[PDB]
């Protein structure tokens, strides 16, 4: 099948909400076949300014002080990390654009 592909967009004001399923709104396709790169998508929401970032980040280093928990999973889930002043969710997945889709579930 295809190698590794994920959305590579900078963090900008997004309109995605903490819904069971959300999109990154990104429109870029970064190739990650030059390594075991993975798709990492973190969606943050501060006061009335929600920013979403999408890029090929390894679920090894904690981004924004957050650790992805679904990189090995086929479905990327938005993890709620201690965010003061706003909420920041980060998720990863070796899937394709799987990151672009930020799943938000209370549970």
């Amino acid at each position: 099948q295809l190698p590794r592909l994920c959305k590579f967009c900078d963090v900008k004001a997004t309109t995605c909400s903490n819904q069971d399923q959300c999109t990154s709104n990104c429109n870029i396709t970064s190739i990650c076949e030059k390594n075991n790169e993975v798709c990492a998508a973190v969606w943050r929401r501060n006061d009335e300014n929600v920013t979403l970032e999408t890029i090929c980040h390894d679920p090894q280093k904690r981004l924004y002080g957050h650790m992805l928990d679904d990189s090995s999973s086929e479905q990327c889930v938005m993890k709620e990390k201690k965010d003061d002043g706003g909420l920041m969710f980060m998720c990863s997945c070796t899937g394709e654009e799987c990151n672009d889709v930020l799943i938000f579930s209370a549970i």
Side-chain angles (χ1 to χ4, degrees):
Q1 275 156 53
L2 317 152
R4 216 107 315 162
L5 270 169
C6 323
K7 302 293 206 63
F8 206 99
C9 283
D10 327 80
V11 17
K12 21 172 188 263
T14 178
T15 61
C16 228
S17 280
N18 39 71
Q19 327 286 97
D20 317 316
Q21 190 198 82
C22 234
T23 303
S24 65
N25 200 267
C26 180
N27 232 46
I28 297 192
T29 297
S30 57
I31 309 288
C32 288
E33 184 250 66
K34 259 133 111 75
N35 252 302
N36 266 64
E37 254 112 283
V38 178
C39 321
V42 39
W43 165 96
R44 343 191 257 94
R45 46 148 153 169
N46 54 78
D47 303 279
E48 77 220 77
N49 243 97
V50 173
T51 89
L52 201 174
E53 210 194 22
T54 342
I55 30 53
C56 229
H57 157 94
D58 255 62
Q60 210 135 78
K61 306 177 219 120
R62 25 285 242 281
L63 174 86
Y64 305 124
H66 312 348
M67 35 125 105
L68 320 158
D69 257 273
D70 249 23
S71 63
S72 66
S73 245
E74 224 239 282
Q75 210 137 38
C76 207
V77 84
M78 294 319 268
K79 260 270 175 95
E80 66 206 62
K81 288 86 167 45
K82 60 231 168 159
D83 301 307
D84 243 51
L87 258 308
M88 315 206 195
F89 284 67
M90 50 126 45
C91 91
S92 46
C93 48
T94 73
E96 173 165 328
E97 296 162 69
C98 51
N99 74 320
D100 102 71
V101 217
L102 21 156
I103 276 84
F104 305 76
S105 82
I107 71 165

